C-alpha cells in the first residue's frame, strides 16, 4: 500500500472546512448559550422574593422566539438582518420566561411574560437565515458567502473577539526572582465573579494567603484553621504525607502557633479587613469574606468550607514542590493552562448581570405595588400582578448597550468591536480574532512572543503591528474549539472505569492522580492503562471527542489530566498505530465520493482533536512519508497552521517572517468585490474594485476559504527596474495607459444618515428645503440638488459641503434652525442611492449613499502579497515605459533595491509562477510546503521559450535603445489598499476652533488643524528659531489679549457697558495694562485660580 500523498490530506482538510466552516466557534458557542445558558442562569437565580408576606415567584423554563420587531404603531413583523442594518434596528428576538407565583406554599398557574429582547447571532440556530440555501439568502438581500457569526446592534455589525484568559479554577505556580518567593495563583469563577486566590512562600519559609478585598496577606495556617480544621494534625495531612512536606508544615504551624482556634483567626481576618470595628461585626464580616471570596468556585455554604481547605492543600503542595525542586514551574503562556472565552460565555455573563438587575427591578416593582394598592389588588389576580411589574427594556438596554460600546460588566472592555468590512479577508480575520486582557503598553516579552503550543491553534505570522503585536492573534485554519458537555457524565464514566475516588483512597507517591478539568477526583494504580483505555474508547466512539486525556509521568510526581470544558483550542491529527496511519485510501475515496463526512471520520477515531495538554504525550509526523513506529500522530496539513489572511501569501516559506506578517496584515486592507450585496448595504464606508482578479499564484486553501469567489486585487505585470528614481524608497511606478484602461480602478462609497428626531413637547425635525429667510443658510447653490421633499436626487454630482438631506430643527430657547446633512468638505462624488424608512421609534430615516470614482494617482498605496508596499511615484505614459522583446509592457515598475534587503524571494517565485500560469493557461499552486517547486517553474518557463531566471531583453521607452541588462519581469499579484491619497490629504488655513481652548479642532471631518506637538516645539527650540516658534504656537493657534492689574497681578475685568477696565479684587482703575498671550495660558490661570492658587503676573516693559 502507498504511503499516501498530500493531495488526499488536502481533500480531507477541504471536507473538514466544508462541514464545519470558519466561524464555527461563534456559532457553536452561541448555540450552547441559547440551548442551556439562559436556562442555567435562570436556575442559578431561581426565584425572586419581594416584600410581600408569604408570597414568592419562582422561574420556570425560558425560551426564545423567532427574530421579530414591533413598530411604533404596534404591529409585530418578522425581522431580517438586511432590514435591521438598513433601518438601524437591533437584530434581536424576544425572550419568554414562564413565572410561577407561589401563594402560601401552593404553586399557581404559570405566567409567560416576555422579559426582554436578546440579540441574535447571524446564521445561528435562532436566526432566520439558518438552513437557507443560496437562493433564499439572495432573496433576503444577504450574501450567500457571508459566514455570519456576528451581531447587528442598532444597524451596525458587532463581532465578539475571543478572549485568551487563564484556565478557571486552575492553580498556576511561578517564582518571582525579584521577590525571591514561590507564588501560586488561581482565578476561581462563580456566577461571572472572578476571585484571585494566591498562596506564596517567602524567603523565611512561611506561607501567606492573598484573598481579594483584603488589604494584607495573612498566614496560610490562619486561614487553614479558620476554614474548619481545628487540630494541627488536620492541617498536617490536609496537604500531603511526604516527609519534606510534613516538615515544612511543622515549621509553618510552629511559626503560626499563636492562634489555635477558629475564632481567633476569624477575628484576625475581620480586623485586617475592617479595623476599628466591634468584635462581632468583624467576625461576621470575616465569615462573609471567607464564604464569598475564598475560592468561590467550591461553593459559598460553610458546609463545603472544609473542602476548600482541601483545595488549599493542593495549592500548598504546588507552592512547596517548586520551593523544593520536586516539580517544575508551569508555563503561563502554555495553551493547556489557557482558555478561550468565546461569545457564548461573555453573552452568558452579560445575560446573568442583566437578568439579576431585572430581577431586582421586578422585586422593587412588586414591593411598591403591594405597598400602594394593598393585599386586595395584589392577590385578586396574581397572573396580571406579576406581568405588570416587569420592565423588559431594563434588561434589553443593558444587553445591547454592552454589545454597542463593547464594554462588559466586571471591568472587561473591548469585547465587542465593529466588524471589519474592508474586504472578504478582513471580516473572516475579525471573526477569528483573539485578544488578551494584558495592557497594550506593557512590555510582555514572555507573552507577546510566539509559543510552541501555538502550532495548529494560533497563526504564527498574522499579527498586528505596534502595541497590539503579540497580544492580538488569529485562530489557525485547523484550530478547533471545544463545546461544553455535562461534566457529571464524564466524572461518572471515569469513576466506573476504575478510578478510585479521592475520599476513598488517600494520594500516594506510587499512585497516579486523576484530574478532571483541573480538579483532582482521585487516584488510580495504573495511570498509563487508564489513559490508553480512555483514548481507545474515544477512538471507538463510545465517549465524545471533547474529552482529552493526558499523562504526566515524572520521576517525582505522576498525574493524569482529563479536560472536557470550553475554551480549549484543538487541532485535528491522524492517529498512527504501529507506524501506519489510520487514514487509508478508502477513507479518502469515501470523502471524495461524499459518502463519508468529516464527523464520520472523527467518529471512527481515524482523526482526533488534540489540545495542548494531550499533545504533550504525542509525537507528530510532519509528512506521510516520515512516519515511523515511534510516531503517534500524523499532521493533516502543515500549511493549515497559518491563519486565513496568512494563507493568501504565495510561498510564505520563501519570505522573511516580518515580510509575511506585513503581507498578512495588508491582506485585510485591500479593495475588491468582498460582498455581492454591497450596493444595497448601508455601510458608512466601503470600497469596490471595478475589475477584481483572482491571483494566478494562489494557495489551494484560498479556493476553499472563498477568496477566489471574492477577490481583492489584480495581477500586475511588474518589471523590477530602476526608472528615473521615482520607484525609490519602496515607491512604485504605474503605467498611464494601464490606469486609463481600468486597471486598479476603485469606487469609494460613503453613507450619510438623517433622522427626523422628535423632541419634547411635540417638536420634531422636518424634511424640506430650508427657506433663505431662516438663519444658518449655507447658500443658494448648496440646495440645488434637493427635491421638494428635502431629499437629494440619485445620480447627482455633489461637492464638499453639499446638502444631501434638507432638515430643519426647532429653535433653542425665533426661526427654525438648520440641521441639514452635508457631504464632507474634502470629499465629493455622485449620489449612488437614497433610502427612506423608519427607525425603532417610528421617526423618518433617510440614508444617502454617495459614490466617488477613485482613479489611481500619486500617493495611492499599492502592496504585494509579500509585504512589499509603496505609493505611486509617477504616472508614466505607455510610450515612455520600456517593453520586452516579446512585446510586453509592464503594468508596474518596482525598485530592485527593495527585493534583497527585505529578503523577499517569494515575490520573485510568485512572478515566475504568474508568468508560467499566464503562458500555459493553468493556475500555479502557491500553497505552503506543498506548492509547485521553484525549479519546476523555471523548467516550464524554459520550455515555454523564455529565460529560466525570468529576465527579458527590454528596450528603453525614451531613447529606444536596448538595455544592457536583462530585466526581470513577471506577473505579481498587487492589491490596492484603502490608504488612498484622496481621503488622506488635509489642508487647513483658518476655520472652526474649539469652544474650550480656542484652538483648531480635531481630525479632518470638521476642518481641524494639524497638531504641533511637544517634539515639534523641542526641535524648533533646537533649531534656535524663536520667532518661528512664537508664530506657530502663539500667533497662529490661540493668540489673545487680556487686561492685567499692575498692583496685584490679578486679571482685570473690562466692562463694555461701562466702557472701563478695572481690577475687582484690588481697584486700580488706572494701572491696568494689556498683555498678549495664548488663550491656553489664560485657561491655565483660570484652572489654577479654581484650584485655590493665586498666580500674580508681574508685568514688565517690552523695552
Amino acid at each position: 500500500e502507498p504511503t499516501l500523498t498530500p493531495d488526499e490530506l488536502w481533500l480531507v482538510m477541504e471536507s473538514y472546512w466544508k462541514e464545519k466552516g470558519f466561524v464555527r466557534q461563534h456559532l457553536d458557542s452561541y448555540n450552547a448559550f441559547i440551548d442551556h445558558g439562559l436556562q442555567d442562569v435562570v436556575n442559578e437565580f431561581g426565584e425572586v422574593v419581594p416584600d410581600i408576606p408569604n408570597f414568592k415567584v419562582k422561574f420556570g423554563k425560558i425560551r426564545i422566539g423567532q427574530p421579530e420587531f414591533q413598530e411604533a404603531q404596534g404591529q409585530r413583523r418578522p425581522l431580517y438582518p438586511m432590514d435591521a442594518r438598513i433601518r438601524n434596528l437591533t437584530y434581536s428576538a424576544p425572550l419568554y420566561l414562564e413565572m410561577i407565583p407561589v401563594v402560601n406554599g401552593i404553586e399557581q398557574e404559570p405566567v409567560e411574560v416576555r422579559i426582554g429582547e436578546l440579540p441574535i447571532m447571524l446564521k445561528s440556530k435562532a436566526c432566520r437565515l439558518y438552513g437557507l440555501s443560496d437562493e433564499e439568502l439572495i432573496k433576503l438581500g444577504e450574501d450567500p458567502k457571508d459566514p455570519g457569526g456576528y451581531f447587528i446592534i442598532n444597524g451596525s455589525e458587532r463581532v465578539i473577539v475571543s478572549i485568551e484568559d487563564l484556565a478557571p479554577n486552575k492553580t498556576l505556580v511561578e517564582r518571582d526572582e525579584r521577590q525571591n518567593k514561590v507564588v501560586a495563583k488561581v482565578f476561581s469563577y462563580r456566577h461571572g465573579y472572578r476571585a484571585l486566590i494566591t498562596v506564596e512562600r517567602k524567603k523565611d519559609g512561611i506561607l501567606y494567603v492573598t484573598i481579594p478585598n483584603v488589604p494584607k496577606p495573612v498566614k496560610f495556617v490562619y486561614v487553614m484553621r479558620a476554614l474548619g480544621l481545628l487540630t494541627d494534625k488536620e492541617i498536617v495531612e490536609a496537604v500531603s504525607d511526604d516527609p519534606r512536606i510534613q516538615q515544612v508544615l511543622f515549621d509553618n504551624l510552629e511559626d503560626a502557633s499563636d492562634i489555635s482556634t477558629q475564632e481567633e483567626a476569624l477575628d484576625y481576618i475581620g480586623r485586617l479587613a475592617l479595623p476599628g470595628q466591634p468584635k462581632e461585626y468583624r467576625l461576621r464580616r470575616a465569615e462573609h469574606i471567607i464564604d464569598n471570596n475564598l475560592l468561590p468556585h467550591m461553593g459559598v455554604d460553610p458546609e463545603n468550607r472544609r473542602a476548600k481547605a482541601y483545595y488549599l492543600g493542593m495549592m500548598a503542595l504546588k507552592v512547596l514542590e517548586l520551593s523544593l525542586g520536586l516539580r517544575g514551574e508551569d508555563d503561563k503562556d502554555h495553551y493547556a493552562n489557557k482558555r478561550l472565552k468565546l461569545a457564548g460565555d461573555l453573552l452568558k455573563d452579560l445575560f446573568r448581570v442583566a437578568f439579576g438587575q431585572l430581577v431586582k427591578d421586578m422585586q422593587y416593582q412588586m414591593t411598591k405595588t403591594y405597598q400602594r394598592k394593598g393585599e386586595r389588588y395584589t392577590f385578586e389576580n396574581i397572573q396580571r400582578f406579576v406581568r405588570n411589574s416587569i420592565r423588559p427594556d431594563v434588561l434589553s438596554e443593558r444587553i445591547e448597550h454592552a454589545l454597542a460600546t463593547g464594554s462588559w460588566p466586571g471591568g472587561r472592555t473591548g469585547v465587542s468591536q465593529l466588524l471589519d468590512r474592508t474586504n472578504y479577508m478582513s471580516t473572516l480575520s475579525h471573526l477569528r480574532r483573539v485578544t488578551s486582557p494584558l495592557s497594550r503598553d506593557q512590555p510582555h516579552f514572555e507573552a507577546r512572543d510566539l509559543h510552541g503550543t501555538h502550532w495548529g491553534r494560533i497563526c504564527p505570522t498574522e499579527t498586528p503591528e505596534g502595541p497590539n503585536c503579540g497580544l492580538v492573534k488569529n485562530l489557525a485554519l485547523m484550530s478547533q474549539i471545544t463545546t461544553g458537555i455535562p461534566e457529571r457524565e464524564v466524572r461518572e464514566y471515569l469513576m466506573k472505569m476504575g478510578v478510585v475516588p479521592i475520599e476513598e483512597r488517600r494520594p500516594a507517591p506510587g499512585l497516579y492522580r486523576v484530574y478532571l478539568n483541573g480538579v483532582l477526583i482521585g487516584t488510580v494504580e495504573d495511570g498509563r492503562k487508564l489513559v490508553e483505555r480512555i483514548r481507545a474508547d474515544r477512538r471507538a466512539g463510545k465517549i465524545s471527542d471533547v474529552i482529552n486525556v493526558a499523562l504526566y509521568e515524572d520521576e517525582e510526581v505522576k498525574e493524569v489530566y482529563i479536560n472536557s470544558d470550553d475554551g480549549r483550542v484543538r487541532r485535528p491529527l491522524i492517529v498512527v498505530e504501529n507506524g501506519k496511519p489510520k487514514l487509508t485510501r478508502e477513507h479518502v475515496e469515501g470523502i471524495k465520493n461524499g459518502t463519508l463526512t468529516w464527523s464520520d471520520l472523527i467518529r471512527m477515531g481515524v482523526i482526533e482533536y488534540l489540545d495542548a495538554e494531550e499533545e504533550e504525550n504525542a509525537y507528530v509526523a510532519t509528512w506521510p512519508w516520515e512516519v515511523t513506529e515511534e510516531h503517534t500522530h500524523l499532521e493533516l496539513m502543515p500549511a493549515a497552521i497559518l491563519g486565513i489572511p496568512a494563507s493568501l501569501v504565495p510561498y510564505p516559506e520563501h519570505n522573511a517572517a516580518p515580510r509575511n506578517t506585513y503581507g498578512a496584515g495588508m491582506a485585510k486592507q485591500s479593495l475588491g468585490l468582498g460582498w455581492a450585496n454591497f450596493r444595497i448595504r448601508v455601510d458608512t464606508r466601503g470600497h469596490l474594485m471595478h475589475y477584481p482578479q483572482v491571483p494566478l499564484v494562489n494557495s489551494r486553501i484560498m479556493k476553499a476559504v472563498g477568496f477566489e469567489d471574492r477577490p481583492a486585487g489584480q495581477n500586475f505585470v511588474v518589471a523590477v527596474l530602476s526608472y528615473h528614481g521615482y520607484n525609490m524608497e519602496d515607491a512604485v511606478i504605474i503605467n498611464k495607459a494601464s490606469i486609463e484602461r481600468g486597471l486598479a480602478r476603485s469606487t469609494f462609497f460613503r453613507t450619510y444618515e438623517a433622522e427626523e428626531k422628535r423632541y419634547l413637547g411635540g417638536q420634531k425635525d422636518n424634511f424640506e428645503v430650508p427657506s433663505p429667510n431662516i438663519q444658518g443658510y449655507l447658500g443658494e447653490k448648496y440646495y440645488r440638488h434637493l427635491d421638494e421633499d428635502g431629499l437629494i436626487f440619485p445620480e447627482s454630482k455633489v461637492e464638499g459641503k453639499d446638502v444631501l438631506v434638507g432638515r430643519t430643527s426647532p429653535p433653542r430657547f425665533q426661526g427654525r434652525r438648520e440641521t441639514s446633512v452635508t457631504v464632507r468638505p474634502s470629499e465629493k462624488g455622485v449620489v449612488d442611492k437614497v433610502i427612506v424608512t423608519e427607525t425603532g421609534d417610528g421617526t423618518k430615516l433617510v440614508k444617502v449613499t454617495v459614490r466617488d470614482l477613485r482613479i489611481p494617482e500619486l500617493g495611492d498605496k499599492f502592496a504585494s502579497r509579500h509585504g512589499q508596499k509603496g505609493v505611486i511615484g509617477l504616472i508614466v505614459p505607455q510610450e515612455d515605459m520600456p517593453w520586452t522583446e516579446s512585446g510586453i509592457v509592464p503594468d508596474l515598475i518596482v525598485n530592485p533595491h527593495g527585493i534583497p534587503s527585505r529578503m523577499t524571494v517569494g515575490q520573485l517565485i510568485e512572478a515566475i509562477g504568474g508568468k508560467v500560469a499566464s503562458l500555459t493557461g493553468r493556475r500555479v499552486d502557491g500553497t505552503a510546503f506543498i506548492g509547485e517547486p521553484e525549479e519546476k517553474l523555471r523548467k516550464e518557463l524554459e520550455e515555454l521559450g523564455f529565460k529560466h531566471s525570468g529576465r527579458e531583453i527590454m528596450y528603453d521607452g525614451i531613447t529606444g535603445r536596448r538595455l544592457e541588462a536583462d530585466i526581470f519581469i513577471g506577473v505579481i499579484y498587487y492589491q490596492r489598499l484603502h490608504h488612498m491619497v484622496a481621503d488622506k490629504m488635509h489642508a487647513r488655513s483658518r476655520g472652526p476652533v474649539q469652544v474650550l481652548t480656542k484652538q483648531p479642532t480635531e481630525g479632518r471631518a470638521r476642518e481641524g488643524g494639524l497638531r504641533f506637538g511637544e517634539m515639534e516645539r523641542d526641535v524648533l527650540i533646537g533649531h534656535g528659531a524663536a520667532m518661528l516658534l512664537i508664530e506657530r504656537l502663539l500667533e497662529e493657534s490661540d493668540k489673545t489679549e487680556v487686561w492685567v492689574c499692575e498692583s496685584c497681578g490679578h486679571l482685570a475685568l473690562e466692562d463694555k457697558r461701562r466702557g472701563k477696565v478695572y481690577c475687582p479684587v484690588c481697584g486700580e482703575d488706572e494701572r491696568i495694562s494689556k498683555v498678549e498671550m495664548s488663550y491656553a495660558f489664560k485657561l491655565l490661570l483660570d484652572e489654577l485660580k479654581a484650584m485655590v492658587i493665586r498666580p500674580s503676573l508681574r508685568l514688565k516693559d517690552r523695552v
Binding site: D709, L743, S918
Partner: protein, 65 residues
C-alpha cells in the same frame, strides 16, 4: 464584476472572446490551447482573461432602483 473590454497592458480587445473562452474551459479543454486558438498569444492578455472572474450575475440579483 464584468470582463474588461481591453487588456490592461496593450489595449487588445478581449471581452469578445472571453465568453467563448469560458465556455470552452467548462467543456474540459486545456485553457492554454483555447487562448492559443482565440489569438491570445501575449501573456498579459492571457493574464487578463485567465485571472478575471465573473461576478456581475451575483450583483444583478440585489435590486437598487
Amino acid at each position: 464584476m464584468i470582463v474588461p473590454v481591453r487588456c490592461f497592458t496593450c489595449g487588445k480587445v478581449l471581452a469578445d472572446k472571453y465568453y467563448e473562452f469560458k465556455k470552452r474551459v467548462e467543456a474540459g479543454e486545456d485553457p492554454g490551447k483555447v487562448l492559443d486558438d482565440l489569438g491570445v498569444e501575449r501573456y498579459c492578455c492571457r493574464r487578463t482573461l485567465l485571472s478575471h472572474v465573473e461576478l456581475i450575475d451575483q450583483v444583478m440579483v440585489y435590486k437598487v432602483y
